Every structure is written in structure tokens, then in C-alpha cells.
């Protein structure tokens, strides 16, 4: 996102606002035809593509509402302050710094990092249903779970990964007990 | 639900991986604190597009 | 199948570590363990 500093409020905010978003789900929910697609955000100067070299030069914000307006649960993680004036960008959403593999872990922000790394490797040999057309491919060594189940603790990302239509496991009623030694 | 992204060679799904390299056309400086008489080496790996 | 397509690679300082600059570019989490820890990394 592109912070904007000279703004009607007399301080910084985002060039993106509600109407923009409104037409989005509007265009999303065609599915008349105006197609307020991602591209439009660009040529409207809404969000700016940014690379590594460029980052050296800027000062980004974690979450907009978190930070941009100048200004509680004990169970909440403790969050940093908005002292920083000259923000020029705000992150789209930080949970978008994870690979395909990571954003299938529930709550990857509560575990111990190598666990994730272990998890990252593991799904890639979790069996599941790799591709719906499967009945007609003549591949070798394809493995298909029977009654795949969409998980419970999903993750706002994973929808995009269409996991919830080709899931790779089952919810199971597990009990953490020292039952019989075995 | 397929997404392409790849080829078929002799009928088997191959995939080009991103390899990675240093970027060309970059001035770069290192040390060489090996006792060799060269205590700083600036480089550039010129490439023609 | 997906992540595989967004893999990278790095044949062969310390190029196995996880530099600041990888923020949001390559996955801070996923990398196969062993010989290629670090040198394989997914977008």
C-alpha cells in the first residue's frame, strides 16, 4: 500500500479507501461489467510494486489501522507503537510473507520455527487428491486419500490455494493421554 | 484446478526451476584479508543483455 | 505441486542463512533440510 501524507485529515493515510474496495467485491460478485480488477489499482496509483533494493529507501507500516492514525486484552500479543511519522508504505498483510507450504500451518505464529520448517517439508508428501482429473491420467505412483476433509482451523490465505476443495488430510478426534504405554 | 507452469517432454511433466545468480553490472567490494598483497578487491561482472 | 513451481535454486559469505532482505520475498519457513538447507527457497 502507498501511504499518502498530505491528506484532507492533515496527516498520512492510504490512497486506498472503501469505494475502491466496494467495487472490488462488486466485480468479485458479478460472478454490469466494469472489472475493477487489481490492475486498476495500479494505474490508479493505489498500490506500488516494490523490490528489495527499493526497500532500503522506504519506511513501511505493519497494519494500517495499527499505525497510521495517531493515538486491552492480557491475552493479546504486545504490539509496537506508531511514533514513526514518515511512513511511505503499509504492508498489505504481513501473513503474506509465507510460502505456499507455510500458510497451511494453523497459527504458525505460536510454534517454534523449525517445527514449521519440518511441517513445510512434510505436507509435500502428505497424500491427498492432487488433481481432480486424476481418474484419467496414466501417471505412476499417484496416491489418493478416500474421504478428504477440509480442515477446521483454516487460514485466510489457504482459500486461494484451493486447499478447501482438494484437502490433504482428515480432522481426527485426538486425545493427548498416556493411555497404554504404546 | 491445474495451473500449467511447465512443459511435457517425452510425455512427462518437467518443470524449470528458478535458478539464481549474482546480478550483472554491479560494482562490488570485498576484502581479502588473506596475507595476499590485495587487501581490497572491487569487481564488476559486466554482461551484455 | 504448487510450491514446487514457486521453488528456486542456488548452486554454489554465508549463503545458507536467511537475510533480512528476504522479507516477504522468499518463505522464511520452508526450505528442505540437509544438503540444500538455505540454497533452496520458495517464493
Amino acid at each position: 500500500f502507498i501511504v499518502e501524507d498530505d491528506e484532507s485529515l492533515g496527516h498520512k493515510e492510504l490512497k486506498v479507501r472503501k469505494g475502491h474496495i466496494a467495487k472490488l467485491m462488486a466485480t468479485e460478485y458479478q460472478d454490469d461489467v466494469e472489472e475493477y480488477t487489481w490492475s486498476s489499482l495500479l494505474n490508479e496509483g493505489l498500490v506500488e510494486y516494490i523490490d528489495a533494493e527499493e526497500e532500503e529507501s522506504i519506511l513501511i507500516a505493519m497494519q494500517p489501522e495499527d499505525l497510521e492514525p495517531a493515538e486491552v486484552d492480557p491475552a493479546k500479543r504486545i504490539r509496537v507503537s506508531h511514533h514513526a511519522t514518515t511512513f511511505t508504505h503499509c504492508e498489505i498483510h504481513p501473513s503474506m510473507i509465507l510460502g505456499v507450504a507455510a500458510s497451511i500451518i494453523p497459527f504458525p505464529d505460536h510454534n517454534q520455527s523449525p517445527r514449521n520448517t519440518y511441517q513445510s517439508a512434510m505436507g509435500k508428501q502428505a497424500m491427498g487428491v492432487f488433481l481432480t482429473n486424476y481418474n484419467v491420467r496414466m501417471d505412476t505412483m499417484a496416491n489418493i486419500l478416500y474421504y478428504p476433509q477440509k480442515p477446521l482451523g483454516t487460514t485466510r490465505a489457504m482459500e486461494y490455494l484451493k486447499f478447501r476443495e482438494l484437502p490433504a488430510g482428515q480432522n481426527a478426534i485426538v486425545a493427548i493421554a498416556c493411555y497404554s504405554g504404546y | 484446478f491445474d495451473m500449467g507452469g511447465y512443459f511435457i517432454i517425452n510425455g512427462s511433466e518437467k518443470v524449470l526451476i528458478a535458478q539464481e545468480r549474482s546480478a550483472g553490472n554491479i560494482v562490488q567490494v570485498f576484502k581479502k584479508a588473506a596475507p595476499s598483497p590485495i587487501s581490497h578487491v572491487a569487481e564488476i561482472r559486466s554482461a551484455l543483455e | 505441486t504448487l510450491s514446487h513451481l514457486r521453488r528456486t535454486n542456488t548452486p554454489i559469505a554465508k549463503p545458507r542463512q536467511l537475510h533480512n532482505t528476504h522479507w516477504g520475498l522468499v518463505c522464511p519457513a520452508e526450505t528442505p533440510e540437509g544438503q540444500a538447507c538455505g540454497l533452496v527457497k520458495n517464493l
Binding site: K18, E28, P64 | - | -
Partner: peptide, 30 residues
């Protein structure tokens, strides 16, 4: 409102477009 400043949960809208725009193989197909 139409010019109102945004809330986090919006962004998922922004994102879901981005993928609708591109997909996941983008740089490959590009």
C-alpha cells in the same frame, strides 16, 4: 462512506483480487 479510511479485514479483498488477476504461477507464465 466511499472515502473512509480502511480496516485490516478489507485487505483480503485487495488480495483476493490480486490472485484473481494473476494466479500463483504468474512469473512462470509471464
Amino acid at each position: 462512506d466511499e472515502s473512509a479510511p480502511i480496516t485490516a479485514e478489507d485487505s483480503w479483498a485487495v488480495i483476493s483480487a490480486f490472485f484473481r488477476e494473476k494466479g500463483l504461477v504468474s512469473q512462470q507464465l509471464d
